[PDB]
């Protein structure tokens, strides 16, 4: 195989040599030279994602290593993974590019922030006061719904075999 061999707290019985997971994947082993137990842990892997604005706007990019701690690879640690190339800002804005776990990225350089859910409003509730509208706005809004697709027919014999 291939993996890190960390110290193990698992006490094997003398006849056992390997160890397996619930899902039948090796998680432990006994060394045949010295009778010690090691926790086989596979080496870190991650989904490299690239966060970029449009090329019309800028050519700056940020890299998110999904699931990878920042010590195993403008470096910020998120629950999604390690984000390199974006600077954490304590301000909260709307989500522009989603990173995950409440973190979003935007271009202003590329910044990473905890996204704001909405503007804060406190309703002046009291037991004897009401708010009555004195005017109105006629609002027209758009709703776009797909209805049909492209109708496709495939000649199975011609596609697989041709002539």
């Amino acid at each position: 195989g291939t993996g890190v061999l960390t110290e193990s707290n698992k006490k094997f019985l003398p006849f056992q040599q390997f160890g397996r997971d619930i899902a039948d994947t090796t998680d432990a082993v006994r060394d045949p030279q010295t009778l010690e137990i090691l926790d086989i842990t596979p080496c870190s892997f991650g989904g490299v994602s690239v966060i970029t604005p449009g090329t019309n706007t800028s050519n700056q990019v940020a890299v998110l290593y999904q699931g990878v701690n920042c010590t195993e690879v403008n470096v910020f640690q998120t629950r999604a993974g390690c984000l390199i190339g974006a600077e954490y800002v304590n301000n909260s804005y709307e989500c522009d590019i989603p990173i995950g776990a409440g973190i979003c990225a935007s271009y202003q350089s590329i910044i990473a922030y905890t996204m704001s859910l909405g503007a804060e409003n406190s309703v002046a509730y009291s037991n004897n006061s009401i708010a009555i509208p004195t005017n109105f706005t006629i609002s027209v809004t758009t709703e776009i719904l797909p209805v049909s697709m492209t109708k496709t027919s495939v000649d199975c014999t011609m596609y697989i075999c041709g002539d």
């Binding site: 037991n127 004195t134 005017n135 706005t137 758009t142 776009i144 209805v147 596609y159």
Partner: protein, 204 residues
């Protein structure tokens, strides 16, 4: 703005392109061209190579049909939703909240779009709200008066009854209030006069 419909078009062409792209895959065979396999090998081994190409292409076609069926189900659900919006928002006024736009729905207009429909929802949005002091009932002559269709409001010194969704203060009379019970049960009842229309008539 029109990202959803274009997305459907984008998926369909891409699926066909992927299926077309699958013709350039060897699938574990010597070549991806059947004519070359026939022109190059004897039928005992050409049958094996053609079998590998057939199973790979058949798997690709089944995969394409499976995603087409799933997308057909999604588009059918969207079309059923669009038909429901056309029936309830265009052909009538809907009391369902947010089904036919944000706000109190007034009417809707259908517009055709490529592979889709665009609904222009005309809604009523309240604005310029004002604070008032409110009471559940008015106590007059030992009787509790409740609004027939509105709400009791006070601007500081005088009490009026107005409709809930627009400010139109009117004098509290017996015509727009109804009497149920005395003043001892309702929590928050306030004391105010209730005008009688017949009182000037018989007085004069």
């Amino acid at each position: 703005a029109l990202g959803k419909l274009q997305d459907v078009v984008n998926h369909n062409a891409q699926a066909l392109n992927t299926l077309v792209k699958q013709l350039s895959s060897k699938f574990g065979a010597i070549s991806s061209v059947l004519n070359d396999i026939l022109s190059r090998l004897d039928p005992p081994e050409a049958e094996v190579q053609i079998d590998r190409l057939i199973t790979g292409r058949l798997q690709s076609l089944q995969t394409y049909v499976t995603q087409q069926l799933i997308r057909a189900a999604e588009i059918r659900a969207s079309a059923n939703l669009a038909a429901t919006k056309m029936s309830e928002c265009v052909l009538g006024q809907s009391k369902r909240v947010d089904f036919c736009g944000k706000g109190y729905h007034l009417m809707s207009f259908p517009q055709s779009a490529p592979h889709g429909v665009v609904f222009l929802h005309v809604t009523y949005v309240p604005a310029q709200e004002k604070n008032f002091t409110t009471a559940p009932a008015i106590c007059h002559d030992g009787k509790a008066h409740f609004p027939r269709e509105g709400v009791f409001v006070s601007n500081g010194t005088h009490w009026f009854v107005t409709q809930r969704n627009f400010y139109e203060p009117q004098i509290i009379t017996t015509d727009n209030t109804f009497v149920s019970g005395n003043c001892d049960v309702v929590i928050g009842i306030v004391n105010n006069t209730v005008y009688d229309p017949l009182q000037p008539e018989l007085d004069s």
